[PDB]
Design a protein around this ligand. Structure first.
Ligand SMILES: Cc1cc(CCCOc2c(C)cc(-c3noc(C(F)(F)F)n3)cc2C)on1
Ligand SMILES: Cc1cc(CCCOc2c(C)cc(-c3noc(C(F)(F)F)n3)cc2C)on1
Lengths: 238, 280, 37, 247, 238, 280, 247, 37, 49
């Protein structure tokens, strides 16, 4: 009964019949900014349903030699729907996220994906002293891929990545992962266009394999901002 | 959930088990939760009143150690670094401290700074010089010369110390503009795209106040930092690849294992080979 | 204790013995030896 | 005035001392504290989270291939699949783990460890394995008949994907030590070996070679003492930009 | 009435009609490991009668020019009966010992043996800087002999050996010595194959003498482990 | 049995004795017990209120003295022991301390360490150098050079002191993995047979932080240890034969009495010869 | 601040000082105490245990032969068997004993000593001896008529194998001193001599030469003062391996 | 007393005046001037 | 096995108890000495000294 789950936010809903319970990052849950923690004094806008809903990004194809994928939040959504609009029209934003990564195959398929939400995932470049550039970091909806997943592209290690909020999608066990992320920052709000609180990484620790009929096995990411708040209204930085 | 832990948990004696529908040793890694199998459920245990303390692993203590954050040596002589230096403060230059700090995402702490000075002749004896370490915050003007007006330090905090005195020391309060320091920053410094990715405290300016002597000396200043009143958040995977720059997390890896980008752990003949097997 | 006027100048605080491992070890919503699935 | 006298130790700078010191910025008001998710107060909290063991640390295995152990349908019985050196001080499969990395910042340890293995083969794949922990004393067992005599768990692949092998704290002394001598009586923890209890059986359309991922963690009865610098990080020259900080 | 004594453990018993009371090392008595002193968390095995019984080692012949004999515990018993089996199959052990050294002669014989139980008797080699080897130390049931009893083969002195738990066998007075040894160690348990808690030393301070019919005068050692406990079960290190 | 003794026991006056079946002066050494004959039973005594204190023989005081455990002198100069040394800690190098410690089988105590430094020119004056003593526990990496990264001491405990300051000092807690230190160990260090018999704390690494001067100096570091908060168990026969190695109890004895393997006490003409007989 | 001034003695390092000092490892948790047999809290406890006197410290006596005094069936009467120099400071039969060794770590002593002799001849052997303690003042007595005038005990060999001679504390001063001058009035303790009270009589099949073993110990009225380094141990060079500790 | 936070840093403990010589002098089970045999 | 060490002395005699150690309630006087329901075991005597 913890293998079945339905998520409903705004005008969107998702169900899964092969879940693995679900993770609440650091045991927290999203919430609006309380008066005793607030800084920006202008009255904020709380769009609710028009922004707190599931947004599904373009899928990626899980291949035998895939290294892994990543999407940075809120960058990945900064140009999608009303969430993107508010982000472009406001200097400050704040929100949690409900992440649902989905991937199904066959009972003859095997593979295991580590689905981890990394706070402040500051990437590193490989074999050079030059820091990563803007285009190396800001991929938007498309997201990026890992060059050296073994060290999470930052000189550390995927082996210890489990220290971060995560779940796995082990094909023989489940077909989706769900992670609820609360606001994660040292400030009550932030400027959405130049800083990413979380990075969603989906890495195939165990490659996709099977001896049955070969078919395209996609991986799809659906993300729903939660308890969105926006301050510092101005024109849009499209 | 939350509770006060002063010692390692005790062990309770456990009996034989043969219960249907109860499989404590089975788990589901996919949930993201760590195995919750207790020793008492995996094997038969005895009762143990565990009195092992857990103080040394308190974050306050783990990070509560003075570590070298800066080391600079220069020539003290007649320059006709001119008898003083300016250091753009950062905590990413020395790997030992850096790696520990980077075990966390966010850190809030006051910083105890200790300044150690040594001198060597370029032998007629070692001079007991007076130095001035001035904290020049972001936006303030940095000294242009050993004797420029900047050193009158009317508002900046300066500390004058002699080489014969114990290392100088003072506490820098937690001074971030946020509730905690960002050990890692997945963002850019400016509103334009040409900005710097990742990662300002200011400049530590140190000079010898004495005018130059007839001969030259090499003076080395070592600065140590010890965080205290510490609060930490979101532990992280430890650094494995050698560091390359103070400005980023760029990596390359050692030339040969261990810690090569290709293999963090050194190789063994095979997965059935016991490296330091006891040959009795 | 502390003879300075600013409290941040005080010596270390080595008395915070509270902890909640579960926020890292069991961040799952639905909480023995019963099948976790 | 008050008559006093200085004791040995006067004027010294002990990196581990604990005293108050002059506040550089008097009347400074630190930024108000805010609640932030994931606060950790004791490093023991961190090592209780299981992380991946690099069990396949062999030549030919690159990157993540080193994190998974591949097992295939056997032709013989009671086959040995692999063993795990329990060296936390000497480089080994357990070194680069949360528990391993943090423990290496200390010299003494005490407590039970736990190894969890997750089977990542296809759903149609079945099998039973036996994971054995052998307390020190002799050579690492090479046959199931021998391994089977130690602490163990028989694992049946099924809906619950993972099994846990508790490595109970079994020591004479209260603590063990991270000796540079792997065969020391105060350091050696024993061995972990894995054998087929039956065999890995799969149908024609399933891969006949499957991987296992092993994780390890400390239990709450764990304790670490005597802090030291970790041997896992070093420096030969200045890092790029370190010197330019003075320019 | 303190010259007569019977010791009974398990299926074994010993009597003596010429005892000299009996010694309880440091006034202690063997006992099982209490929960508040325990370290190894696995449930221990307490064999009782199959291990807590008298084991008699091979005798030695007391000669006019003998220098003395010694037996290290538990090494001397690590290969005898069920005690030896448990020791070979377990990583950790713990136990006290009831020692009974016996030697009778004639009312026309004279001789005095110092029977002392030395804790941590670390031997030293003579006239060399090289530390004693494995075979110099581990003699098993046979035990060893002293090279320089005068200094207890360790650079100290037999004269002050009385500081250790002991008794004497003075032929005109008694024919046996009995010493009860409690667990003696800095740890609640230990690995039996590489460390000896006690060393039983029997040294003839006063040589054997007589003018009557000459006959072989043996010295026999019987040792009974007490309150045995074993932890860390695995295969046998035979 | 157990009781609090603050002074030597008093003596009670005793009378004449002629009791049948009562023979206090007769004993049986074979029992292993020491004679229990009281002075009052051996002769006629008077009453004596003995006020002699017994404080100086308290174990805490007997062992509570700072003793030299390490002494190392090296050359401080341009080496083109390179201005630093690594000492594998042990308490068996100096006989005075060693013998006292070896009067016990087990010892539990915290250790107060004092470091004394002196220098001599190889005359233009003595430099007031700064030194760093770093405690490198078992398993940690030891410095390879006078200025290697190891010295940034991010977690190891280091103490920096000047030659002009009073000796450096700190307390090392009782740090055994057992309830007490084993002054003697009748066993081997490893699971194999080739192991070392008998008898790890770590390494004390000391360097001069100052760069070398134009001339050379000899620097000597003396380390003293004073145990405190002491608990001792199982007294032992004192060492008589001169020590040979720090690694074992090997013995050889002096060439001639006293303390020769052949005779500990020097000889006298005969058992009826009174050595320092008073010739009035 | 507080006005102060440094006193003479400031900055000095007295090996016998007693102060607290900076803890090297903050928050370190020492191993829990466990009960261990044989705890000793005062060295006086140790010297109360009797140990063997090397009475036969003569040329020709090697090793343990020096620890036993051989007495044989006499042909004459009132024979002197042996005497014992009571030198604890000057090398003598009492020096290498528990009481002797430990006392030599001090300079002043006070209290009664006790000498116990155990007869180790055959059971069929009989005899009576007289052990005499002679307070200082003159020459060591050489005849029983003279020795007999001091503190003594007449010993009859029998079932109880041992006899005890109490050397009562008889001194003018509260303490005696371990002077390098054996004839000093503050050091000399007197003499102990042993004569045949009757004779050692044995039958044909018993050895006609028997040994005695003498032990000595302090009573509970003993006291030691003014600690010093024992003259019983010295060093001329580095011990083997001492220098290799730096390699 | 002790101004350091760790109790092991404190000065010496010279107040343990209890003792039990008998554990070394009379370790015999069966306890005047009566024959010890 | 089950044993007693005997020291010759004033008490002239020693007793060795052969405790009833059997699987079955009773043993049998079988004409087959090696029968599992008949064989009682052995008694041996050695010099202790
Ligand atoms: C990220 C991050 C940022 C920090 C703050 C480090 C602060 O340390 C500095 C500061 C602000 C001041 C001095 C300093 N040195 O001397 C003086 C004085 F002159 F004010 F006393 N201040 C030295 C360092 C390294 O820690 N982590
Ligand atoms: C057996 C046995 C073991 C011991 C422990 C001796 C501990 O002494 C060492 C230690 C651990 C540390 C230092 C030390 N010197 O300096 C430092 C500092 F740098 F940490 F301050 N530590 C010196 C010695 C001799 O005592 N008996």
């Amino acid at each position: 009964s913890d293998r079945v789950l339905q998520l409903k936010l705004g005008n969107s809903a998702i169900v899964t019949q092969e879940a693995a319970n679900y993770c609440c990052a650091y045991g927290e849950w999203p919430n609006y900014l309380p008066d005793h923690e607030a800084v920006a004094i202008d009255k904020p806008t709380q769009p609710e349903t028009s922004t707190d809903r599931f947004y599904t990004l373009r899928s990626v194809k899980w291949e035998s030699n895939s290294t892994g994928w990543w999407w940075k939040l809120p960058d990945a959504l900064n140009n999608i729907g009303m969430f993107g609009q508010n982000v472009q029209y406001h200097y400050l934003y704040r929100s949690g996220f409900l992440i649902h990564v989905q991937c199904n195959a066959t009972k003859f398929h095997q593979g295991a994906l580590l689905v981890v939400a990394i706070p402040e995932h500051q990437r590193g470049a490989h074999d050079t002293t030059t820091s990563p550039g803007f285009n190396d970091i800001m991929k938007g909806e498309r997201g990026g891929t890992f060059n050296h997943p073994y060290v999470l592209d930052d000189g550390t290690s995927i082996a210890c990545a489990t220290i971060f909020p995560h779940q796995w999608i082990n094909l023989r066990t489940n077909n989706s992962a769900t992670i609820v992320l609360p606001w994660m920052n040292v400030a009550p709000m932030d400027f959405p266009l130049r800083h990413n609180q979380w990075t969603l990484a989906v890495i195939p620790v165990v490659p996709l394999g099977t001896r049955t009929m070969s078919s395209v096995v996609p991986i799809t990411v659906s993300i729903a901002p939660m308890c969105c708040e926006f301050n510092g209204l101005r024109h849009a930085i499209t | 959930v939350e509770s006060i832990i002063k010692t390692a948990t005790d062990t309770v004696k456990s009996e034989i088990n043969a219960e249907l529908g109860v499989v404590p040793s089975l788990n589901a890694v996919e949930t993201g939760a760590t195995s919750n199998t207790e020793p008492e459920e995996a094997i038969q245990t005895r009762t143990v009143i565990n009195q092992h303390g857990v103080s040394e692993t308190l974050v306050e203590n783990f990070l509560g150690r003075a570590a070298l954050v800066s080391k600079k040596s220069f020539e003290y002589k007649n320059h006709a670094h001119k008898n003083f230096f300016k250091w753009t403060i950062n905590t990413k230059s020395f790997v030992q401290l850096r790696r520990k700090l980077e075990l966390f995402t966010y850190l809030r702490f006051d910083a105890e700074i200790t300044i150690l000075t040594t001198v060597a002749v370029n032998y007629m004896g070692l001079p007991d010089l007076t130095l001035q370490a001035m904290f020049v915050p972001t936006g303030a003007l940095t000294p242009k010369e050993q004797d420029s007006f900047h050193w009158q330090s009317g508002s900046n905090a300066s500390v004058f110390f002699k080489i014969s005195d114990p290392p100088a020391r003072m506490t820098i309060p937690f001074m971030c503009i946020n509730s905690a320091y960002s050990v890692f920053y997945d963002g850019f410094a400016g509103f334009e795209k040409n900005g710097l990715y990742g990662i300002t405290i200011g400049n530590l300016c140190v000079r010898i106040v004495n005018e130059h002597q007839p001969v030259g000396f090499t003076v080395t200043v070592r600065v140590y930092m010890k965080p205290k009143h510490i609060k930490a958040w979101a532990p992280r995977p430890p650094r494995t690849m050698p560091y390359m720059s103070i400005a980023n997390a760029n990596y390359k890896g050692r030339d040969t294992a261990p810690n090569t980008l290709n293999a963090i752990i050194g190789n063994r003949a095979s997965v059935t080979t016991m490296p330091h097997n006891i040959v009795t | 204790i502390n003879f300075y006027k600013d409290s941040y100048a005080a010596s270390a605080s080595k008395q915070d013995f509270s902890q909640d491992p579960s926020k890292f070890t069991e961040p799952v919503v639905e909480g023995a030896g019963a099948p976790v699935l | 005035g008050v008559p006093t006298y200085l004791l040995p130790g006067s004027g010294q700078f002990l990196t581990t001392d604990d005293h108050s010191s002059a506040p550089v910025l008097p009347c400074f008001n630190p930024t108000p504290e805010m609640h932030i998710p994931g606060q950790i107060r004791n490093m023991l909290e961190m090592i209780q989270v299981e992380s991946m063991m690099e069990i396949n640390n062999t030549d030919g295995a690159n990157g993540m291939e080193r994190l998974r152990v591949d097992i295939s349908v056997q032709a013989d019985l009671d086959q040995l699949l692999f063993n795990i050196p329990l060296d936390i001080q000497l480089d080994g499969p357990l070194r680069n783990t949360l528990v391993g990395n943090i423990s290496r910042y200390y010299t003494h340890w005490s407590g039970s460890l736990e190894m969890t293995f997750m089977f990542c083969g296809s759903f149609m794949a079945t099998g039973k394995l036996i994971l054995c922990y052998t307390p020190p004393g002799g050579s690492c067992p090479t046959t199931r008949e021998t391994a089977m005599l130690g602490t163990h768990i028989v694992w049946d692949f099924g809906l619950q994907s993972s099994i846990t092998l508790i490595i109970p704290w079994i020591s004479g002394s209260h603590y063990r030590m991270f000796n540079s001598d792997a065969k020391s009586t105060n350091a050696n923890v024993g061995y972990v070996t894995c054998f087929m209890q039956t065999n890995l059986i799969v149908p024609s359309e399933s891969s006949d070679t499957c991987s296992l991922i092993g994780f390890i963690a400390a239990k709450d009865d764990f304790s670490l003492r005597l802090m030291r610098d970790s041997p896992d990080i070093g420096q030969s020259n200045h890092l790029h930009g370190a010197e330019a900080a003075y320019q």
